[PDB]
Structure formats: C-alpha cells, structure tokens
mmCIF file of C-alpha atoms in Angstrom:
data_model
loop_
_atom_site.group_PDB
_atom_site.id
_atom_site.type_symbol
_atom_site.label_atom_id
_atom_site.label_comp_id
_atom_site.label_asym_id
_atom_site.label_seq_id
_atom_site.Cartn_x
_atom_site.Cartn_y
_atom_site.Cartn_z
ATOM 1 C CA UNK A 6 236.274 49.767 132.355
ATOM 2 C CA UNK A 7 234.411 49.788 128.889
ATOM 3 C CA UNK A 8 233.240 46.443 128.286
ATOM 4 C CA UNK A 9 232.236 45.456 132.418
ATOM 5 C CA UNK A 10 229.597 47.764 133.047
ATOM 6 C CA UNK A 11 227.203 45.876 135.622
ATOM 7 C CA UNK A 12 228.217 46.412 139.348
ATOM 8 C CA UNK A 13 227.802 42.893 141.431
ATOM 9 C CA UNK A 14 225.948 43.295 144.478
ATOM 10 C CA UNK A 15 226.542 41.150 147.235
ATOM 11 C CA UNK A 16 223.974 40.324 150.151
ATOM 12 C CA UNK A 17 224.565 38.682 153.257
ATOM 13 C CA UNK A 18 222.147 37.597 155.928
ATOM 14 C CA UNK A 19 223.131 40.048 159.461
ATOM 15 C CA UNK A 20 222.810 42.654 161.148
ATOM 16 C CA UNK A 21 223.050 46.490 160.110
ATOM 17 C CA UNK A 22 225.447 46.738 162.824
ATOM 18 C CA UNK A 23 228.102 44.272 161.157
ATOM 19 C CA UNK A 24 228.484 45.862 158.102
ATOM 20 C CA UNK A 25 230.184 48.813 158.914
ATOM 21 C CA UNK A 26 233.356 46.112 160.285
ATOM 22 C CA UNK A 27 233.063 44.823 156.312
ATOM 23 C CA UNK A 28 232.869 48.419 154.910
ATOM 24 C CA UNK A 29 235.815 49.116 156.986
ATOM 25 C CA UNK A 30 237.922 45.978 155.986
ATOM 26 C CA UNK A 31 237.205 47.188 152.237
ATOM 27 C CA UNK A 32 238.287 50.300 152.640
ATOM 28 C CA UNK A 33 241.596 49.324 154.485
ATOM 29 C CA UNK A 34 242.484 47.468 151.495
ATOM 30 C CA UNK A 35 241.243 49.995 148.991
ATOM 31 C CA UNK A 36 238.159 48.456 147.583
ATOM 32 C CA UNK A 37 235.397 50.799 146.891
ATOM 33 C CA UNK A 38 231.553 50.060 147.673
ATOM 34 C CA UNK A 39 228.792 51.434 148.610
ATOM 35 C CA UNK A 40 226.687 50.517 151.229
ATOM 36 C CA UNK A 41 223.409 52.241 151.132
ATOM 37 C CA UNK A 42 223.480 52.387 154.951
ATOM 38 C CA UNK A 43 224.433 56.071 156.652
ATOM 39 C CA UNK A 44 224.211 54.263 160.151
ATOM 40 C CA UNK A 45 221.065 52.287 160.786
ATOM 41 C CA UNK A 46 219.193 53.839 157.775
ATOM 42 C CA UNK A 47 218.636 52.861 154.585
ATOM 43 C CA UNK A 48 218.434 55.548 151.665
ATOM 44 C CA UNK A 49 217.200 54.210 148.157
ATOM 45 C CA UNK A 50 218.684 56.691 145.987
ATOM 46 C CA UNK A 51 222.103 55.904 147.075
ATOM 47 C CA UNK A 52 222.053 52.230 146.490
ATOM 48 C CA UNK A 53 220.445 52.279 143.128
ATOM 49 C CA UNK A 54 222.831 55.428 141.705
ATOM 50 C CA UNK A 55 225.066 53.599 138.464
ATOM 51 C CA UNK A 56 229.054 54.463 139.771
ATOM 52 C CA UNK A 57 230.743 57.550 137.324
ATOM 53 C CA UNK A 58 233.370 56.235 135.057
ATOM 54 C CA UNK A 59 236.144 58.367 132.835
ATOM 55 C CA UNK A 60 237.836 56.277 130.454
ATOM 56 C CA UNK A 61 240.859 58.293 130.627
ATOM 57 C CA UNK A 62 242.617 57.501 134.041
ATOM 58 C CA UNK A 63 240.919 54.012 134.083
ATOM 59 C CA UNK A 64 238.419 55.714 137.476
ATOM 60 C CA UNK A 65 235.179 53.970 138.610
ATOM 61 C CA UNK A 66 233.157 55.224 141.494
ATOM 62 C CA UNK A 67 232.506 51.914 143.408
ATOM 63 C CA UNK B 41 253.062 64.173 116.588
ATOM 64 C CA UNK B 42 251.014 65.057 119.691
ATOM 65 C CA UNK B 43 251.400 61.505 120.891
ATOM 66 C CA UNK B 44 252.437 58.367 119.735
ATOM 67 C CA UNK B 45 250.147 55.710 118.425
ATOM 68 C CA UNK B 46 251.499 51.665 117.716
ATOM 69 C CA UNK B 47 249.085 49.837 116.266
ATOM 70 C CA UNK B 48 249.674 46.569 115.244
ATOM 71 C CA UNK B 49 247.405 44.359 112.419
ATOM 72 C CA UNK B 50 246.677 40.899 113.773
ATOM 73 C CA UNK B 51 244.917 37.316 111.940
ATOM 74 C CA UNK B 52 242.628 35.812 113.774
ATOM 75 C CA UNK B 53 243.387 31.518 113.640
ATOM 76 C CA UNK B 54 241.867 29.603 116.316
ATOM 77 C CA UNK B 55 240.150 30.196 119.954
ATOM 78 C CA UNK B 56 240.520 28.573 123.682
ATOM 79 C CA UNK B 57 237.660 27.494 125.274
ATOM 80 C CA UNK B 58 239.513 26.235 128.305
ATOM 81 C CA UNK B 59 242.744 24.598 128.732
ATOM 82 C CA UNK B 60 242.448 23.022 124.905
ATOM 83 C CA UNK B 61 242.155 24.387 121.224
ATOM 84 C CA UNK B 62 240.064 25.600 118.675
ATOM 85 C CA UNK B 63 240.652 25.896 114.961
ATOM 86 C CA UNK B 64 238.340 28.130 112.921
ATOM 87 C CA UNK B 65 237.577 32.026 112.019
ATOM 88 C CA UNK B 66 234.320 34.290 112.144
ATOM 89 C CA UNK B 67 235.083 35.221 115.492
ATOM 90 C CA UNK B 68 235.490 38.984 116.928
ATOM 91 C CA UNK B 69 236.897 40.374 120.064
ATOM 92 C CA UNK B 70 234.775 43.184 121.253
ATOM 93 C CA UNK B 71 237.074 46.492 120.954
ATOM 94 C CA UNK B 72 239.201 47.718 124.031
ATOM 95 C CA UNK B 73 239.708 44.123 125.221
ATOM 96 C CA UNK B 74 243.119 43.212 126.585
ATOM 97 C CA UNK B 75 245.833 42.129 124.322
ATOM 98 C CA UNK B 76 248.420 40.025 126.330
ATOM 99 C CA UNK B 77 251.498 37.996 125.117
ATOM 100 C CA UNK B 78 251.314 33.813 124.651
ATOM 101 C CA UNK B 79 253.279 31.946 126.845
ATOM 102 C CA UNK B 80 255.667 29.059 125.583
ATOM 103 C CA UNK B 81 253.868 25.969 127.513
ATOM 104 C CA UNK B 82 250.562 27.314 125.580
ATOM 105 C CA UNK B 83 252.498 27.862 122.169
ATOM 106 C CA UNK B 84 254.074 24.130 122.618
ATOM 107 C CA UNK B 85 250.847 22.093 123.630
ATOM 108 C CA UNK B 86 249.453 23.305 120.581
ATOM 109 C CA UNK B 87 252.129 21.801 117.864
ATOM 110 C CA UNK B 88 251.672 18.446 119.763
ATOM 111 C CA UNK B 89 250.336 15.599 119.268
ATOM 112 C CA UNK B 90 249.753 12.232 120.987
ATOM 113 C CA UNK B 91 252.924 10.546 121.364
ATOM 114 C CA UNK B 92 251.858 7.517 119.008
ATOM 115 C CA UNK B 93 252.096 10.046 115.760
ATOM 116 C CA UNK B 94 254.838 12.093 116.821
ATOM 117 C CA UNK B 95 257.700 13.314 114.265
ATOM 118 C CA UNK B 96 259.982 16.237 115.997
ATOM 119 C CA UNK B 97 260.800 18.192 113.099
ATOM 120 C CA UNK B 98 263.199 20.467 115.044
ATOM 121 C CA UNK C 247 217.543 8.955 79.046
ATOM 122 C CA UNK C 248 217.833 8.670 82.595
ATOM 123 C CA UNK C 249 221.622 9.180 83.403
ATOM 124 C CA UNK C 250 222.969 11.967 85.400
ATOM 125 C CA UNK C 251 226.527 13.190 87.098
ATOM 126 C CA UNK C 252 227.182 13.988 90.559
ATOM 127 C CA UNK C 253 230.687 15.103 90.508
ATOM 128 C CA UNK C 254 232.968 14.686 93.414
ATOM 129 C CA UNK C 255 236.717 16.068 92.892
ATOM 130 C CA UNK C 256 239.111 17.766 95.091
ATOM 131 C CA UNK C 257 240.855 19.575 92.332
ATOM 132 C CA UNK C 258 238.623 21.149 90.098
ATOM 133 C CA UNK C 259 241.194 23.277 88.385
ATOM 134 C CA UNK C 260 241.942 19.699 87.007
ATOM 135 C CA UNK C 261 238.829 17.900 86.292
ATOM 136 C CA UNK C 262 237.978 18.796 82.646
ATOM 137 C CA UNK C 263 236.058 22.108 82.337
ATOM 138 C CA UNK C 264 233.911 20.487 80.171
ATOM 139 C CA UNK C 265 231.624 18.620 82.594
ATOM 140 C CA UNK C 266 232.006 20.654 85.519
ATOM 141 C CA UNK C 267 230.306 23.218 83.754
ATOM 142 C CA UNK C 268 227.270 21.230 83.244
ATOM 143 C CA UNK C 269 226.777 20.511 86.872
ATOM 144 C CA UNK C 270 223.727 23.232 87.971
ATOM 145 C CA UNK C 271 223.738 22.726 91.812
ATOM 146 C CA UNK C 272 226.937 22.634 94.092
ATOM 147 C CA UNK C 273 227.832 20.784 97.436
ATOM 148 C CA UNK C 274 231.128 23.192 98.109
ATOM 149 C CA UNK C 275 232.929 21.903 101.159
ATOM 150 C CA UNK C 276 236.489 23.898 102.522
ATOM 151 C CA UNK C 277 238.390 24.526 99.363
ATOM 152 C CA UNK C 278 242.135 25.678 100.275
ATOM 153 C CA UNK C 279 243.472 26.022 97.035
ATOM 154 C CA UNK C 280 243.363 29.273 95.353
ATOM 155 C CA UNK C 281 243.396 28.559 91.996
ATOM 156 C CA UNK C 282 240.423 26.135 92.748
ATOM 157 C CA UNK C 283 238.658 28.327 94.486
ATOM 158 C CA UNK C 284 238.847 30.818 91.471
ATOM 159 C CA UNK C 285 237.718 28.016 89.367
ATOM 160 C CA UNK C 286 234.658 27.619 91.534
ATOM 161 C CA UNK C 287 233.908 30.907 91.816
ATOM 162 C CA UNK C 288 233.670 31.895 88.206
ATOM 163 C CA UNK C 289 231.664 28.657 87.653
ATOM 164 C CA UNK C 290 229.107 29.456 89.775
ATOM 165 C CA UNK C 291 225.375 31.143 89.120
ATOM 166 C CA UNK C 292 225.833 35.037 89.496
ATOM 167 C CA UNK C 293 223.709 35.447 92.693
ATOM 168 C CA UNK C 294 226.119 32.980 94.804
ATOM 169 C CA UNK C 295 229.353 34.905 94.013
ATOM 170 C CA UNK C 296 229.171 37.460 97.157
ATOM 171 C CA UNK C 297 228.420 34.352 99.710
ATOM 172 C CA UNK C 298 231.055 32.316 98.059
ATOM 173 C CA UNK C 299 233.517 33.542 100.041
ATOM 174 C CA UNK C 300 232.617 31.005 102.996
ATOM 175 C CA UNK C 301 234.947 27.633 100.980
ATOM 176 C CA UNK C 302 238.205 29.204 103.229
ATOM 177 C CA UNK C 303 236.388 28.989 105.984
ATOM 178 C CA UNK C 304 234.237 26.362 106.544
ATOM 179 C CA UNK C 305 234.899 23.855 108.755
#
C-alpha cells in the first residue's frame, strides 16, 4: 500500500461494448477498476483521478 | 500501554537475486516492506557446497 | 638511494610497528580482524579515519 503507488493500466484492442462483460467478471471476483466508460462515453476526469488510499485498514480505491 | 508494539533488531548478511546467493552489506530495505520467515530448503542450499568439497559437520 | 617498501601483510598487528609506520600511502583490502583493524586505523593520516570504516565491508 505504501511503497506500490503507480496503478497499471491495461488496454485491449475492442469494442466499448465488451468491456462492460470484463468490468463485470472483475467485479464478481472482487477486483476493483475503473473503467472510464459510463456506457458508450468516455469522461477524462475519471480515468486520470489517482485511487484514495488510508494506510490504516490497508484500503485502495481501484 | 495503549497498544502493543514488538519490534525486533535485525543484521543485514547477504541478498537473493534469484534462486542463488549473495554475500555482502550496504544494502537497505525501503521501510514498511514485508518481513516473512526463511524456509528450510532456502536455509540448507545456502550451507552447501558442491559435493566434491563436502564435510557434514552435523 | 633508490630503495623503497611496498608492504604486503595480512596481520599487521604483527608486522613490526616500526616499518609500517613509514609506509605513507595504503592499499587496504577486507580486514576481519579487529585488533588489525585498530592497528590500521590509528596508523592512518587523520582525514581517512571517518571513511575507514569500509575494511569490514569490502568485498
């Protein structure tokens, strides 16, 4: 939590439309990301935002 | 009192590159890494040598 | 008249201190014993004490 502080960002050549199945599968297995997609629109501030930590409880946003 | 606190002093001695050994000192650990445990088949390949110049001491 | 010492030794606590101490420069490699390191330490110039502490760890 301290001493990672970069968030890896994965890109993958599809659709809009199939990403929402791979947001899903993450979430089913308790994996938070973000997206940056609200349904076939992009917003910038959301995919550029650094994730919230505490260093108490060992919490990370995404 | 309001908690308790363990802290243990340690000595660094030698560093693993990968799957082998390194002897030698100067060498920090940033703070709030992980501290784990060494297992015994990474405790006994260290100790070792080739099988030419061994003497099993006990 | 032309002679001079280079003196090699791996225990200078027992090499006479009567020729080490003429030697001006050093070539100090891992020492490991403590009362040679002492002996080194003391022996050499003033401004080399506070990096002297290296010999233990050198390798």
């Amino acid at each position: 939590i301290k001493l990672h502080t970069e968030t890896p960002c994965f890109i993958l050549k599809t659709d809009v439309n199939n990403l929402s199945e791979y947001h899903k599968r993450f979430v089913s297995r308790n994996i938070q990301i973000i997206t940056g997609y609200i349904g076939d629109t992009f917003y910038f501030k959301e995919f550029n935002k650094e994730p919230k930590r505490i260093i108490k409880d060992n919490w990370v946003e995404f | 009192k309001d908690e308790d606190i363990f802290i243990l002093t340690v000595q660094p001695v030698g560093i693993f590159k990968g799957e082998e050994f390194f002897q030698g000192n100067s060498m920090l650990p940033s703070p709030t890494e992980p501290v784990f445990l060494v297992e015994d088949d990474i405790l006994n390949k260290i100790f070792s040598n080739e099988k030419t110049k061994i003497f099993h001491l006990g | 008249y032309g002679l001079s010492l280079m003196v090699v030794s791996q225990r200078p606590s027992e090499v006479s201190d009567t020729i080490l101490s003429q030697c001006n420069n050093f070539i100090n490699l891992r020492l490991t014993n403590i009362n040679d390191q002492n002996y080194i330490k003391n022996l050499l110039p003033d401004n080399s004490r506070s990096i002297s502490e290296i010999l233990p760890t050198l390798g």
